[PDB]
Structure formats: structure tokens, C-alpha cells
Tab-separated table of C-alpha atoms (C1' of nucleotides) and ligand atoms in Angstrom:
chain	number	residue	atom	x	y	z
A	173	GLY	CA	115.698	104.679	83.112
A	174	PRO	CA	118.658	102.739	84.528
A	175	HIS	CA	120.283	105.956	85.818
A	176	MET	CA	117.252	107.577	87.509
A	177	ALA	CA	117.989	107.201	91.216
A	178	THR	CA	114.880	106.148	93.126
A	179	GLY	CA	115.770	107.207	96.689
A	180	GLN	CA	115.848	103.599	97.909
A	181	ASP	CA	119.395	103.543	99.337
A	182	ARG	CA	118.494	103.819	103.040
A	183	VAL	CA	116.160	102.154	105.522
A	184	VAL	CA	114.791	104.826	107.909
A	185	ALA	CA	112.314	104.336	110.752
A	186	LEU	CA	110.397	106.865	112.847
A	187	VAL	CA	109.261	105.750	116.336
A	188	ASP	CA	106.610	107.907	118.081
A	189	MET	CA	105.209	107.215	121.550
A	190	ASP	CA	101.382	106.913	121.610
A	191	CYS	CA	99.696	109.735	123.704
A	192	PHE	CA	103.051	110.049	125.463
A	193	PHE	CA	102.337	112.235	128.508
A	194	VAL	CA	99.105	110.259	129.092
A	195	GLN	CA	101.079	106.985	129.091
A	196	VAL	CA	103.586	108.447	131.572
A	197	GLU	CA	100.723	109.345	133.913
A	198	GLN	CA	98.959	105.969	133.365
A	199	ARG	CA	102.122	104.077	134.262
A	200	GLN	CA	102.381	106.047	137.490
A	201	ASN	CA	98.656	105.861	138.359
A	202	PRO	CA	97.059	102.521	137.387
A	203	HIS	CA	93.581	103.978	138.014
A	204	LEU	CA	93.982	105.927	134.737
A	205	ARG	CA	94.824	102.913	132.576
A	206	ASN	CA	92.526	101.912	129.689
A	207	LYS	CA	90.289	104.923	130.326
A	208	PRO	CA	89.445	108.133	128.518
A	209	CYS	CA	92.046	110.438	129.959
A	210	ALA	CA	93.986	113.548	129.102
A	211	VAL	CA	96.895	115.570	130.468
A	212	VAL	CA	96.358	119.277	131.194
A	213	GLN	CA	98.529	122.205	132.150
A	214	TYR	CA	97.082	124.571	134.792
A	215	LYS	CA	93.464	124.540	136.024
A	216	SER	CA	91.877	127.890	136.854
A	217	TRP	CA	91.191	129.085	133.284
A	218	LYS	CA	88.588	126.784	131.631
A	219	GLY	CA	89.871	123.694	133.529
A	220	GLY	CA	93.341	123.832	132.033
A	221	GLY	CA	94.599	123.309	128.505
A	222	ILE	CA	94.825	119.750	127.186
A	223	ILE	CA	98.148	118.694	125.633
A	224	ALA	CA	97.758	114.887	125.335
A	225	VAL	CA	94.721	112.613	124.879
A	226	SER	CA	94.290	108.833	125.258
A	227	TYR	CA	92.790	107.031	122.259
A	228	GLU	CA	89.680	106.181	124.297
A	229	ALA	CA	89.162	109.906	124.919
A	230	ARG	CA	89.870	110.764	121.259
A	231	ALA	CA	86.854	108.603	120.387
A	232	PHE	CA	84.672	111.275	122.063
A	233	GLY	CA	86.290	114.118	120.109
A	234	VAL	CA	88.738	115.223	122.800
A	235	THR	CA	91.819	116.853	121.255
A	236	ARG	CA	95.026	118.652	121.971
A	237	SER	CA	94.451	122.421	122.488
A	238	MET	CA	90.970	121.876	124.016
A	239	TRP	CA	90.146	123.501	127.341
A	240	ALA	CA	89.393	120.734	129.859
A	241	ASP	CA	85.950	122.247	130.618
A	242	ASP	CA	84.958	121.861	126.953
A	243	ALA	CA	86.477	118.386	126.771
A	244	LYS	CA	84.319	117.402	129.752
A	245	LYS	CA	81.320	118.523	127.768
A	246	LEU	CA	82.244	115.974	125.078
A	247	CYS	CA	83.279	113.279	127.584
A	248	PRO	CA	81.854	113.759	131.087
A	249	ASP	CA	83.804	110.795	132.508
A	250	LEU	CA	87.131	112.025	131.099
A	251	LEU	CA	89.925	111.559	133.599
A	252	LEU	CA	92.555	114.286	133.846
A	253	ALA	CA	96.154	114.364	135.045
A	254	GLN	CA	97.816	117.759	135.621
A	255	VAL	CA	101.384	118.665	134.742
A	256	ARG	CA	103.504	119.423	137.811
A	257	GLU	CA	103.898	123.088	138.789
A	258	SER	CA	107.169	124.397	140.216
A	259	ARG	CA	108.242	127.996	140.875
A	260	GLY	CA	104.888	129.158	139.508
A	261	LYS	CA	105.079	127.453	136.116
A	262	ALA	CA	104.510	124.146	134.397
A	263	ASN	CA	107.417	121.770	134.930
A	264	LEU	CA	107.845	118.943	132.412
A	265	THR	CA	110.719	117.091	134.112
A	266	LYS	CA	108.788	113.800	134.583
A	267	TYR	CA	108.162	113.530	130.824
A	268	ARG	CA	111.734	114.466	129.888
A	269	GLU	CA	113.061	111.707	132.181
A	270	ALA	CA	110.599	109.195	130.677
A	271	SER	CA	111.804	110.285	127.230
A	272	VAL	CA	115.414	109.546	128.178
A	273	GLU	CA	114.314	106.011	129.186
A	274	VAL	CA	112.906	105.371	125.717
A	275	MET	CA	115.743	106.986	123.794
A	276	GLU	CA	118.376	104.945	125.664
A	277	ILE	CA	116.586	101.729	124.635
A	278	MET	CA	116.353	102.832	121.007
A	279	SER	CA	120.065	103.686	120.967
A	280	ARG	CA	120.886	99.987	121.574
A	281	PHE	CA	119.725	99.059	118.075
A	282	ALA	CA	121.139	102.054	116.126
A	283	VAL	CA	122.267	105.649	116.394
A	284	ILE	CA	119.146	107.821	116.667
A	285	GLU	CA	118.045	111.371	115.964
A	286	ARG	CA	115.947	112.762	118.819
A	287	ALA	CA	113.327	114.718	116.910
A	288	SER	CA	111.035	115.562	119.853
A	289	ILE	CA	110.350	114.543	123.484
A	290	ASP	CA	108.469	111.496	122.164
A	291	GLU	CA	109.988	110.569	118.815
A	292	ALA	CA	113.209	109.557	117.176
A	293	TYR	CA	114.473	108.624	113.736
A	294	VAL	CA	116.596	105.509	113.204
A	295	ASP	CA	118.873	104.790	110.221
A	296	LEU	CA	118.629	100.991	110.011
A	297	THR	CA	120.529	100.563	106.730
A	298	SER	CA	123.604	98.917	108.293
A	299	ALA	CA	121.613	96.850	110.816
A	300	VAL	CA	119.535	95.560	107.897
A	301	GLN	CA	122.689	94.588	105.975
A	302	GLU	CA	123.835	92.675	109.079
A	303	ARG	CA	120.554	90.846	109.678
A	304	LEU	CA	120.402	89.948	105.973
A	305	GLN	CA	123.824	88.295	106.195
A	306	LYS	CA	122.522	86.400	109.236
A	307	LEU	CA	119.343	85.234	107.488
A	308	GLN	CA	121.307	83.548	104.659
A	309	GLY	CA	118.547	84.017	102.097
A	310	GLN	CA	115.981	82.574	104.498
A	311	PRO	CA	112.509	84.074	103.878
A	312	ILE	CA	110.772	86.246	106.457
A	313	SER	CA	107.920	84.714	108.428
A	314	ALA	CA	104.755	86.724	109.072
A	315	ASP	CA	105.234	85.760	112.730
A	316	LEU	CA	108.213	88.122	112.847
A	317	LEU	CA	105.908	91.009	111.862
A	318	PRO	CA	102.995	90.646	114.302
A	319	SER	CA	102.007	94.347	114.418
A	320	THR	CA	103.068	95.484	110.915
A	321	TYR	CA	100.782	96.998	108.244
A	322	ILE	CA	101.898	97.102	104.595
A	323	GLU	CA	100.526	100.327	103.144
A	324	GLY	CA	98.481	99.796	99.973
A	325	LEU	CA	97.812	96.104	100.625
A	326	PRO	CA	95.795	94.011	100.308
A	327	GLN	CA	94.764	94.790	96.766
A	328	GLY	CA	92.914	92.919	94.024
A	329	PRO	CA	90.847	89.777	94.826
A	330	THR	CA	87.900	89.784	104.901
A	331	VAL	CA	85.788	91.614	107.471
A	332	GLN	CA	87.807	92.478	110.596
A	333	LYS	CA	90.850	94.772	110.882
A	334	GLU	CA	93.377	92.211	112.067
A	335	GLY	CA	92.336	89.925	109.224
A	336	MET	CA	92.922	92.710	106.710
A	337	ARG	CA	96.329	93.445	108.230
A	338	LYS	CA	97.289	89.781	107.843
A	339	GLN	CA	96.000	89.573	104.257
A	340	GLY	CA	98.089	92.581	103.278
A	341	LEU	CA	101.170	91.184	104.998
A	342	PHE	CA	100.708	87.839	103.265
A	343	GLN	CA	100.491	89.484	99.831
A	344	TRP	CA	103.615	91.504	100.577
A	345	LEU	CA	105.641	88.543	101.816
A	346	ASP	CA	104.639	86.364	98.854
A	347	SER	CA	105.749	89.042	96.423
A	348	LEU	CA	109.211	89.223	98.070
A	349	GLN	CA	112.415	88.183	96.292
A	350	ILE	CA	114.383	87.069	99.351
A	351	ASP	CA	117.327	85.995	97.181
A	352	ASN	CA	118.470	89.504	96.157
A	353	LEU	CA	120.311	90.876	99.199
A	354	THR	CA	120.021	94.340	97.578
A	355	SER	CA	116.228	94.380	97.021
A	356	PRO	CA	114.885	97.611	98.593
A	357	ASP	CA	111.565	95.921	99.467
A	358	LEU	CA	113.432	93.124	101.266
A	359	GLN	CA	115.567	95.727	103.039
A	360	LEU	CA	112.452	97.557	104.249
A	361	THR	CA	110.996	94.242	105.435
A	362	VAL	CA	114.068	93.378	107.498
A	363	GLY	CA	113.985	96.928	108.854
A	364	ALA	CA	110.411	96.300	109.979
A	365	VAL	CA	111.528	93.087	111.736
A	366	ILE	CA	114.131	95.105	113.646
A	367	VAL	CA	111.539	97.768	114.530
A	368	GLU	CA	109.191	95.078	115.900
A	369	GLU	CA	112.068	94.066	118.203
A	370	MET	CA	112.804	97.700	119.192
A	371	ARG	CA	109.145	98.382	120.016
A	372	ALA	CA	108.924	95.125	121.994
A	373	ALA	CA	111.967	96.170	124.016
A	374	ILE	CA	110.534	99.644	124.692
A	375	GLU	CA	107.251	98.186	125.960
A	376	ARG	CA	108.901	95.413	128.009
A	377	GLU	CA	111.376	97.753	129.709
A	378	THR	CA	109.211	100.893	130.181
A	379	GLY	CA	105.551	99.874	129.896
A	380	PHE	CA	105.113	102.440	127.113
A	381	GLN	CA	103.588	101.592	123.735
A	382	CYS	CA	104.608	103.261	120.500
A	383	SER	CA	103.925	103.316	116.803
A	384	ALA	CA	106.460	103.450	114.021
A	385	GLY	CA	106.939	103.984	110.316
A	386	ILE	CA	109.495	102.183	108.124
A	387	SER	CA	110.438	103.582	104.701
A	388	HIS	CA	113.402	104.856	102.685
A	389	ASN	CA	113.579	108.353	104.201
A	390	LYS	CA	112.475	110.457	107.166
A	391	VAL	CA	109.369	112.105	105.639
A	392	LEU	CA	107.877	108.810	104.470
A	393	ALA	CA	108.748	107.113	107.758
A	394	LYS	CA	106.967	109.871	109.730
A	395	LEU	CA	103.931	109.720	107.424
A	396	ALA	CA	103.857	105.919	107.668
A	397	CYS	CA	104.015	106.063	111.462
A	398	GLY	CA	100.782	108.066	111.518
A	399	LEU	CA	98.800	105.676	109.275
A	400	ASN	CA	97.983	102.997	111.901
A	401	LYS	CA	98.371	104.468	115.387
A	402	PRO	CA	98.139	103.300	118.155
A	403	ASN	CA	100.504	100.442	118.971
A	404	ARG	CA	101.200	99.404	115.348
A	405	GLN	CA	103.915	99.973	112.768
A	406	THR	CA	103.542	100.621	109.043
A	407	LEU	CA	105.821	99.905	106.095
A	408	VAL	CA	105.584	102.389	103.188
A	409	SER	CA	107.428	101.012	100.173
A	410	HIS	CA	108.702	103.079	97.251
A	411	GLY	CA	106.100	101.375	95.067
A	412	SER	CA	103.273	102.416	97.377
A	413	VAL	CA	103.986	106.119	96.867
A	414	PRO	CA	102.012	106.920	93.666
A	415	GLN	CA	98.724	105.635	95.062
A	416	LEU	CA	99.365	106.984	98.566
A	417	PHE	CA	100.146	110.466	97.267
A	418	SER	CA	97.404	110.478	94.639
A	419	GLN	CA	94.837	111.452	97.287
A	420	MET	CA	97.145	112.840	99.990
A	421	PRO	CA	96.389	116.518	100.794
A	422	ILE	CA	99.532	118.623	100.461
A	423	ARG	CA	99.250	119.855	104.087
A	424	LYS	CA	99.640	116.345	105.512
A	425	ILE	CA	103.324	116.238	104.580
A	426	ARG	CA	105.632	117.522	107.327
A	427	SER	CA	106.597	121.172	106.594
A	428	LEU	CA	103.754	121.850	104.155
A	429	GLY	CA	101.098	122.529	106.767
A	430	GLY	CA	101.603	126.310	106.843
A	431	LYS	CA	102.078	129.235	104.453
A	432	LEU	CA	104.337	127.347	102.001
A	433	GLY	CA	101.838	124.525	101.540
A	434	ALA	CA	99.043	127.058	101.106
A	435	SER	CA	101.080	128.767	98.387
A	436	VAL	CA	101.752	125.464	96.595
A	437	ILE	CA	97.974	124.875	96.555
A	438	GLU	CA	97.128	128.418	95.496
A	439	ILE	CA	99.850	129.066	92.900
A	440	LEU	CA	99.654	125.683	91.206
A	441	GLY	CA	95.913	125.131	91.564
A	442	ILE	CA	96.378	121.612	92.943
A	443	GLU	CA	95.193	119.770	96.085
A	444	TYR	CA	97.169	116.492	96.351
A	445	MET	CA	100.882	115.654	96.614
A	446	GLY	CA	100.762	113.458	93.509
A	447	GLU	CA	99.733	116.403	91.301
A	448	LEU	CA	103.186	117.880	91.947
A	449	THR	CA	104.771	115.367	89.610
A	450	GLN	CA	103.500	117.163	86.538
A	451	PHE	CA	105.812	120.184	87.045
A	452	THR	CA	109.483	120.387	86.166
A	453	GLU	CA	112.082	120.955	88.850
A	454	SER	CA	112.777	124.426	87.411
A	455	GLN	CA	109.059	125.318	87.554
A	456	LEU	CA	108.862	124.407	91.236
A	457	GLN	CA	112.108	126.289	91.972
A	458	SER	CA	110.728	129.359	90.207
A	459	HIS	CA	107.683	129.382	92.443
A	460	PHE	CA	109.137	128.247	95.778
A	461	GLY	CA	112.907	128.877	95.631
A	462	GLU	CA	115.886	126.653	94.809
A	463	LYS	CA	115.811	124.471	97.901
A	464	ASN	CA	112.038	124.154	98.331
A	465	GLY	CA	111.617	123.501	94.620
A	466	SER	CA	114.189	120.701	94.539
A	467	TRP	CA	112.737	119.242	97.742
A	468	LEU	CA	109.191	119.240	96.337
A	469	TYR	CA	110.290	117.773	92.996
A	470	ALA	CA	111.962	114.861	94.767
A	471	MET	CA	109.474	114.429	97.586
A	472	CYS	CA	106.386	114.052	95.383
A	473	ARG	CA	108.226	111.028	93.840
A	474	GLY	CA	108.911	109.596	97.338
A	475	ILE	CA	112.548	110.769	97.427
A	476	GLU	CA	114.082	112.780	100.244
A	477	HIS	CA	117.697	113.031	101.337
A	478	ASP	CA	117.668	114.641	104.819
A	479	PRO	CA	120.033	112.529	106.954
A	480	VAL	CA	119.223	110.905	110.286
A	481	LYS	CA	121.480	113.045	112.485
A	482	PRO	CA	123.484	111.302	115.199
A	483	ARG	CA	121.875	113.363	118.017
A	484	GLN	CA	120.136	111.747	121.031
A	485	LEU	CA	120.245	114.934	123.151
A	486	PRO	CA	118.363	118.213	122.578
A	487	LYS	CA	120.408	121.076	121.079
A	488	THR	CA	118.899	123.689	123.386
A	489	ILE	CA	117.470	123.754	126.913
A	490	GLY	CA	114.759	126.356	127.477
A	491	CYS	CA	112.158	127.704	129.935
A	492	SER	CA	109.145	129.782	128.913
A	493	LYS	CA	105.935	131.181	130.350
A	494	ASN	CA	103.026	133.128	128.896
A	495	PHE	CA	101.311	135.853	130.931
A	496	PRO	CA	98.023	136.274	129.078
A	497	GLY	CA	95.523	139.105	129.186
A	498	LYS	CA	95.370	140.545	132.664
A	499	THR	CA	98.213	138.556	134.290
A	500	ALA	CA	100.795	140.283	132.038
A	501	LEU	CA	103.785	141.717	133.908
A	502	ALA	CA	103.513	145.491	134.396
A	503	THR	CA	106.057	146.224	137.156
A	504	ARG	CA	109.835	145.923	137.281
A	505	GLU	CA	109.621	143.744	140.399
A	506	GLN	CA	107.261	141.360	138.575
A	507	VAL	CA	109.555	141.007	135.571
A	508	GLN	CA	112.495	140.388	137.884
A	509	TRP	CA	110.667	137.782	139.959
A	510	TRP	CA	109.566	135.763	136.929
A	511	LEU	CA	112.948	136.040	135.201
A	512	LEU	CA	114.345	134.587	138.417
A	513	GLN	CA	111.841	131.717	138.568
A	514	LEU	CA	112.603	130.767	134.934
A	515	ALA	CA	116.350	131.131	135.605
A	516	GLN	CA	116.123	128.853	138.630
A	517	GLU	CA	114.417	126.134	136.606
A	518	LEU	CA	116.975	126.603	133.835
A	519	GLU	CA	119.858	126.339	136.304
A	520	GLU	CA	118.429	123.097	137.717
A	521	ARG	CA	118.020	121.548	134.279
A	522	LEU	CA	121.409	122.758	133.036
A	523	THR	CA	123.235	121.447	136.095
A	524	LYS	CA	121.662	118.024	135.617
A	525	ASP	CA	122.472	118.168	131.890
A	526	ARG	CA	126.132	118.939	132.645
A	527	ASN	CA	126.362	115.999	135.056
A	528	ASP	CA	124.640	113.546	132.714
A	529	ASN	CA	126.009	114.586	129.334
A	530	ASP	CA	129.486	116.144	129.790
A	531	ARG	CA	128.711	119.466	128.122
A	532	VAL	CA	128.086	123.120	129.038
A	533	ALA	CA	125.935	125.765	127.356
A	534	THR	CA	127.721	128.997	126.458
A	535	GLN	CA	124.968	131.335	125.176
A	536	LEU	CA	121.781	132.583	126.840
A	537	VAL	CA	118.911	133.698	124.599
A	538	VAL	CA	116.249	135.953	126.123
A	539	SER	CA	112.954	136.318	124.267
A	540	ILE	CA	109.933	138.383	125.266
A	541	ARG	CA	106.511	139.255	123.895
A	542	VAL	CA	104.870	142.629	124.572
A	543	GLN	CA	101.123	143.236	124.826
A	544	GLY	CA	99.431	143.633	121.467
A	545	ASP	CA	102.143	141.947	119.378
A	546	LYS	CA	100.675	138.993	117.507
A	547	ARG	CA	104.103	137.392	117.000
A	548	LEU	CA	105.522	134.607	119.158
A	549	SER	CA	108.626	136.664	119.968
A	550	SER	CA	108.539	140.439	120.088
A	551	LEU	CA	112.259	140.558	120.790
A	552	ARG	CA	115.239	138.197	121.025
A	553	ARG	CA	118.611	139.095	122.527
A	554	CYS	CA	121.599	136.889	123.291
A	555	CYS	CA	124.255	137.291	125.955
A	556	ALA	CA	127.074	135.174	127.347
A	557	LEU	CA	126.365	132.266	129.694
A	558	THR	CA	129.532	131.808	131.771
A	559	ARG	CA	128.179	130.286	135.003
A	560	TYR	CA	125.221	128.086	135.881
A	561	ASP	CA	123.859	130.602	138.379
A	562	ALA	CA	120.204	131.638	138.303
A	563	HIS	CA	120.622	135.074	139.895
A	564	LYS	CA	123.355	135.861	137.356
A	565	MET	CA	121.378	134.685	134.301
A	566	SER	CA	118.244	136.513	135.472
A	567	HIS	CA	120.185	139.722	136.079
A	568	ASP	CA	121.835	139.376	132.640
A	569	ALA	CA	118.460	138.709	131.000
A	570	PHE	CA	117.075	141.823	132.660
A	571	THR	CA	120.099	143.793	131.485
A	572	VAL	CA	119.579	142.741	127.881
A	573	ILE	CA	115.809	143.418	127.877
A	574	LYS	CA	115.386	146.458	130.148
A	575	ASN	CA	115.591	148.896	127.227
A	576	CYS	CA	112.226	147.605	125.980
A	577	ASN	CA	110.478	149.370	128.871
A	578	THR	CA	108.663	152.377	127.378
A	579	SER	CA	107.684	153.667	130.835
A	580	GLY	CA	109.693	156.671	131.904
A	581	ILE	CA	108.636	155.661	135.412
A	582	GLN	CA	111.252	153.214	136.683
A	583	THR	CA	108.807	151.070	138.695
A	584	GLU	CA	106.253	150.282	135.981
A	585	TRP	CA	106.741	148.183	132.868
A	586	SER	CA	104.997	149.279	129.685
A	587	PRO	CA	103.887	147.826	127.459
A	588	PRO	CA	103.315	144.890	129.838
A	589	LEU	CA	105.016	141.586	129.063
A	590	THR	CA	102.896	138.637	127.942
A	591	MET	CA	105.736	136.119	127.658
A	592	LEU	CA	109.231	135.431	129.035
A	593	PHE	CA	111.575	132.802	127.552
A	594	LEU	CA	115.109	131.818	128.548
A	595	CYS	CA	117.041	129.409	126.351
A	596	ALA	CA	120.521	127.977	126.852
A	597	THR	CA	122.302	127.232	123.553
A	598	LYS	CA	125.732	126.598	121.950
A	599	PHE	CA	126.892	123.601	123.981
A	600	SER	CA	130.598	122.702	124.272
A	601	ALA	CA	132.056	119.480	125.644
A	602	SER	CA	133.128	119.826	129.277
B	176	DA	C1'	93.385	133.193	127.507
B	177	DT	C1'	96.323	127.335	123.967
B	178	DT	C1'	101.033	126.621	126.379
B	179	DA	C1'	105.583	125.101	126.536
B	180	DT	C1'	109.034	124.107	124.094
B	181	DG	C1'	112.304	122.479	120.130
B	182	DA	C1'	114.198	122.662	115.314
B	183	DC	C1'	115.781	125.107	111.505
B	184	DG	C1'	115.759	128.440	107.404
B	185	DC	C1'	116.615	133.390	105.981
B	186	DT	C1'	119.300	137.558	105.636
C	134	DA	C1'	123.029	138.038	115.263
C	135	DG	C1'	117.983	138.630	115.254
C	136	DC	C1'	113.715	137.267	112.949
C	137	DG	C1'	110.259	134.069	110.710
C	138	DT	C1'	108.211	129.428	109.953
C	139	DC	C1'	106.660	124.973	111.394
C	140	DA	C1'	105.532	121.873	114.740
C	141	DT	C1'	102.542	120.000	118.520
D	969	XG4	N1	103.841	121.617	126.674
D	969	XG4	C1	103.349	121.094	125.540
D	969	XG4	N2	103.516	119.788	125.321
D	969	XG4	C2	102.971	119.362	124.185
D	969	XG4	C3	102.301	120.114	123.290
D	969	XG4	N3	101.832	119.329	122.242
D	969	XG4	C4	102.236	118.112	122.542
D	969	XG4	N4	102.938	118.068	123.717
D	969	XG4	C5	103.492	116.905	124.410
D	969	XG4	C6	102.424	115.955	124.935
D	969	XG4	C7	102.511	114.754	123.996
D	969	XG4	O1	102.173	113.594	124.754
D	969	XG4	C8	103.983	114.772	123.580
D	969	XG4	C9	104.320	114.098	122.267
D	969	XG4	O2	103.594	114.769	121.210
D	969	XG4	P1	102.834	113.936	120.108
D	969	XG4	O3	103.661	112.844	119.583
D	969	XG4	O4	102.489	115.007	118.975
D	969	XG4	N5	101.393	113.429	120.698
D	969	XG4	P2	101.055	112.073	121.524
D	969	XG4	O5	102.301	111.361	121.834
D	969	XG4	O6	100.343	112.557	122.807
D	969	XG4	O7	99.991	111.269	120.702
D	969	XG4	P3	100.253	110.419	119.383
D	969	XG4	O8	99.866	109.001	119.749
D	969	XG4	O9	99.258	110.996	118.339
D	969	XG4	O10	101.673	110.545	119.011
D	969	XG4	O11	104.307	116.174	123.491
D	969	XG4	C10	102.156	121.482	123.585
D	969	XG4	O12	101.561	122.256	122.817
D	969	XG4	N6	102.686	121.973	124.721
D	970	MG	MG1	103.441	110.563	120.153
D	971	MG	MG1	105.636	113.023	118.545
DNA sequence: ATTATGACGCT
DNA sequence: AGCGTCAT
């Protein structure tokens, strides 16, 4: 009733760059613009593995995780850009620097949470309060929302997509009570006005296009962002949640796409997020644990409390390389050489991080995978990181992993190593 | 032989 | 601290 909190206290947006690495390469090379194109890492095995796909190429069925050779079967005119290689491995520096460009623009409008190389959450609650005081009860013109979809509208009592977008927006705006400065729907609308401005600034100052979601929490903002990619933003109101979730497969919600979501489906005998509402909070906790149960009980009603963290910089800086099948490292000299290449990249990135961001990592995490282990990491060991020196970190990494070598022979390495991973963590202000 | 990361929960 | 899960 009057006391049931509805999770409508915040305005949260999620901004995600469209086919980000592709856009970075299309900015640099105009010949790739407005074409089916993809970004690949490496080349010799099956043409390289695709990690980003322009929307024109997606129309042909090209996807992330495809081998380029297979993608070319679906799209013979597909254009390809390769990730830079340095010290024998993929080097993603160009895309990290482009990411910093975007995140610095977003930070002008609000404190952001860097959630990946291409996306950030924004808590717009206070900015919305401010813009509402400025508006002085003045209604919001559809011209301020030129790329916004309102999820669930139009409804009730008309052929092309832009016309449908405008019909839905008109219905939404006419239903608005622009007098109540505390109306959650009005707050979301003003948030969407601000996100239009943020996306305009990103495109004007970088050339990059993005999509966004606007809702009352992070999960709904992320889901909304996906609904109308590319180059559009979507508002998911609290009221839109029952219909949206009534046919939403459980796996589409962030964090339910793996074993937990499968167990929700299997234990409860349900398929859609909306079906979760029929269970009590205690029932869900009994199946999925305290925290998961409370999270599911709230989230199927559109309510989620995870805060937008004030964090524009990544928490860790890491370097990793797989050595699949027959390229796996089987000698001590090989393991040392690749530990050194990874450590040299790490030292470069860490030194630049220290100069830019006034902090120093203090812990070095070494992870390996051995042949025949189906897990990501076969072993993880930490040691101290006291100097940004690649020879030192690579010698320390060897010292912490050398006991994994089954070979009594000192020259060989058995079982051979199919992955090396160095990660700098536990940053302190310097 | 999907790869290269990054986040975060569990014990 | 080291491992597992999720993500893409
Ligand atoms: N190295 C590496 N990079 C990856 C991987 N997967 C993605 N990336 C990189 C390449 C991606 O460009 C970037 C951002 O990932 P998204 O937001 O998930 N995809 P995008 O922005 O391309 O398309 P959309 O319009 O649907 O958002 O992360 C991977 O497995 N490995
Ligand atoms: Mg993206
Ligand atoms: Mg993303």
C-alpha cells in the first residue's frame, strides 16, 4: 500500500558505445565507415577471432566469437580491422585510450561508474532535481527527446519505425504530470533529456555513437539500453515492468545468464522473469540463498538497489595470453620469455597509469592454466609488487609459479602451459 | 583453437 | 588468500 517502497528513488542511466572497437577503427580509417566490418584478433588460425561487429555486418549473421573465415562465408565483402600486436600478443591500448575520451566527457554531467571499456553507469538523480528547478514546471517538448524510445508505448488505438517512436513518445509526454516535481515518471523524462545531451556531446567531441538506457536502477537501465541499439536511447519506467518482464526470458537479465539462471528455471519450473513474482521472498531465499533470493524478489518487481559507484578508473590492470593446443609452453625458457613479454606490457601500462591517475598498484596476481584443465585458471598466486620493473615482476611471477612444473627435468615444463596472466591490483594513492 | 580482460561473490 | 561465476 502506502508503505510499499517501489524502487523509484533514483534516476540511473547506462551508456554503451555501439560496436565500440569497430567505431574506433572506422574513425581512424574512413574507408571502413558505413560498411559491414568487424575487428579481429590474430590472423593465422581461421582468419582471426572476431570481437566486434558493425550493425551492417550483423545483418548478415556475423557475430562476436566467429572465426573471420566463417564470417566471410556469411558476408564475402566483410571488411576486417586487426587489433595491434606488440611483444607477441594482442595490444588493446588504442581502445583503452578511446574509452578514456568517452568517460571524460560523461564525467562532465555526473559522477560515473566505469563498468567496462565501453560502458558506464550514471546516477542522474541530483542533476534531474537541478534541471527540474530550472524548468519551473514547464512541460518537456518532444524535440528535446529526438532519439528516445518509451518502452511499452504506443499502446491502444503507423507504419514506419520513426513514426512509431514518435507516437510512443507523444503518448508518454501527454500522460505526464509536469507539476509534481517528485513524479518518478517526470524524473525519468528529465533524465532522458540529460542523456540526449550527454550522447550528443560524446558524438560531437569523439565521432562515436552510443546507445543508452534510462530507468530507476542499474539492471533496468542496462536492459533498456539494449532494447533499441544502435544510436538510440530507451526509457523503461516502473510501470512498464510488468508487461516487459511478462515475456522476458530469465537469462536476459544481467547475472542470470549462467548456472544460477538455469537453476531458477529448473527448480521453479518457470521461463520468464515475471513468473518470479508468485514466490515469497523466503521461498526464493530457500532455493538460491539469502542474497540471491532477496535480489530476485525485488528485481522481478523492477526494484534493485546496487549503487552507481564513483569509479571512472579500472580497479585492476592485467595482461593475459592463451597458448592453445600445440603452441602451449613446454620449456622453462619459453615460460620465462612470455612472462617477460606480459610483464613488459604491464610495466608500460602501469607507468602510464601512475602518471595519469596518481596511484600505484601494490599486489601482483599470477594466474596460469595447465594443459587438460577445463577451468579458466588452474592456479592463482599473489606476491608483492614493489617496483614497476618488468624483469622483477616476471622473475617474481616465475618464482611463485615454478613449483607447478611436474617435470623433474629442469629444462622442460610439464604439463605445458596454455595460459599466462599477470594482474596488478590493490592500488594506493601516490 | 574464442581471446583478452574486468568485476565480484564465496569460504 | 585462492577459487568460482558471469560477462563479452
Ligand atoms: N579482447 C576482447 N574484447 C572484447 C571481447 N568481447 C567484446 N570485446 C570488446 C570489443 C567491443 O567493441 C567492446 C565493447 O563490448 P560490447 O559493448 O559488449 N560490444 P559492442 O560495443 O561491440 O557492440 P554493442 O553495440 O552491441 O554494444 O569490448 C572479447 O571477448 N575479447
Ligand atoms: Mg557497446
Ligand atoms: Mg559494453
